[PDB]
From Swiss-Prot:
Induction: Constitutively synthesized.
Part of the full-length chain shown: 4 to 381 of 650
EC number: 3.6.4.10
Bilayer topology term: Peripheral membrane protein
Protein name, entry field: Heat shock cognate 71 kDa protein
CC annotations in GO: cytoplasm; cytosol; lysosomal membrane; melanosome; nucleolus; nucleus; plasma membrane; presynapse
Residues recorded with modification N6-acetyllysine: 105, 243, 316, 325
Length: 378
């Protein structure tokens, strides 16, 4: 094609292409190596990726996200019913199948989860095409190891709808392992642990690889734990701070809260590299500017319990896999949240000082491996 590898994430998607023995993680029109898995509908346009997330604060009812949580599921599923209570957009029942309902150009419309995801995949396809200067058709699309046949089918369908010939649907943890060349034959079998902390989900997977063949020994995690939760802790902290300094509560002003949230998420990223971050919001509430800062130490404290809690699924995966810490040959960090120094410390300490595979940007590892596999299947 070349064929490309696409990581269709719950919160952010990435696309990579293997060329001249190297993988290239493609930046979008805004220079971003990751693209929000968001799609927005307005009185006049359909926005995707950065354009959609950048206006979520002002158009919450018609800005769709989390389509990956619905893809391949039935409307009556307990998780679907639970998730619906937290989404600002409407989810309706079409013959037992869930559909997101929105307003677009003054008319009510509904889309199957795979249709929303096809929109995100189309964006990823275009991003690759703009980079390559060639039409992109063949692709390998990844999915969480626990996805069933229906979820895998619906994901493949999203690709097909986007105009992609999905060469194969592979597991995200496996893709991450492939990125580090852990699929190469060295003789005996090897046990690898994938620690994936994304935007809204946490996945731990233990793979046993031998002769280039992968076996998923165990999976653990929390489908409702990720970077967003850390942002939440920061938001509450700053709402308290603003209330203290201005005797005003912004909690009910949706916009103000989303603006603070965006500022928090950004400050969070900075804290992975620096020990302090500045938050400066012009007229956050009733014309009041909010200029402040937060230290890495404070950020760690606000999230201490959540960070520490990531180790429980690690111990569980190990027990389910019938393996001791020492039997893990490689630990691979995946997901943007694993860039947090405290998380890396916790995991390494748990593994008694064992080195972590973190040379490939964690949030790019899945796409990286997917691109390699795509080239192999091409
Ligand atoms: N440098 C960083 N430090 C801390 N968190 C980060 C960093 N980069 C990205 N993140 C967080 O990673 C999350 C997105 O992770 P990602 O693995 O891309 O998600 P998914 O693949 O599950 O959609 C967001 O919560 C984002 O804030
Ligand atoms: Cl773009
Ligand atoms: Cl490597
Ligand atoms: Mg991911
Ligand atoms: Na994850």
């Amino acid at each position: 094609g070349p064929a490309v590898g696409i990581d269709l994430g719950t919160t952010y998607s990435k696309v990579g292409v293997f060329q001249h023995g190297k993988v290239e993680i493609i930046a979008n029109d805004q220079g971003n190596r990751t693209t929000p898995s968001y799609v927005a509908f307005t009185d006049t346009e359909r926005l995707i990726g950065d354009a959609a997330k950048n206006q979520v604060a002002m158009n919450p009812t018609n800005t769709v996200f989390d389509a990956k949580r619905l893809i391949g599921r039935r409307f009556d599923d307990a998780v679907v019913q639970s998730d619906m209570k937290h989404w600002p957009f409407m989810v309706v029942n079409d013959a037992g199948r869930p559909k997101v309902q929105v307003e677009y150009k003054g008319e009510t419309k509904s889309f199957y989860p795979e249709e929303v995801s096809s929109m995100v995949l189309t964006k990823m396809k275009e991003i690759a095409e703009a980079y390559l200067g060639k039409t992109v058709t063949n692709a390998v699309v990844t999915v969480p190891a626990y996805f069933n046949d229906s979820q895998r089918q619906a994901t493949k369908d999203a690709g097909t709808i986007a105009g992609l010939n999905v060469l194969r649907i592979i597991n995200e943890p496996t893709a991450a392992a492939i990125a580090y060349g852990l699929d190469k034959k060295v003789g005996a079998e090897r046990n690898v642990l994938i620690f994936d902390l994304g935007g809204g989900t946490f996945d731990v997977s233990i793979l046993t690889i031998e002769d280039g063949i992968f076996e998923v020994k165990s999976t653990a995690g929390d489908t409702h734990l990720g970077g967003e939760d850390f942002d939440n802790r920061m938001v509450n902290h700053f709402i308290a701070e603003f209330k203290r300094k201005h005797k005003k509560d912004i909690s009910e002003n949706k916009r103000a809260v989303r603006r603070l949230r965006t500022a928090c998420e950004r400050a969070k990223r900075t804290l992975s590299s620096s020990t302090q971050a500045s938050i400066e919001i012009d007229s956050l509430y009733e014309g009041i500017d909010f200029y402040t800062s937060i230290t890495r130490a404070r950020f760690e404290e606000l999230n201490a319990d959540l960070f520490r809690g990531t180790l429980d699924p690690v111990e569980k995966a190990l027990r389910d896999a019938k393996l001791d810490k020492s039997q893990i040959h490689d630990i691979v960090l995946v997901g943007g949240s694993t860039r947090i120094p405290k998380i890396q410390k916790l995991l390494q300490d748990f593994f008694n000082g064992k080195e972590l595979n973190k040379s490939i940007n964690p949030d790019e590892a899945v796409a990286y491996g997917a691109a390699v596999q795509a080239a192999i299947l091409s």
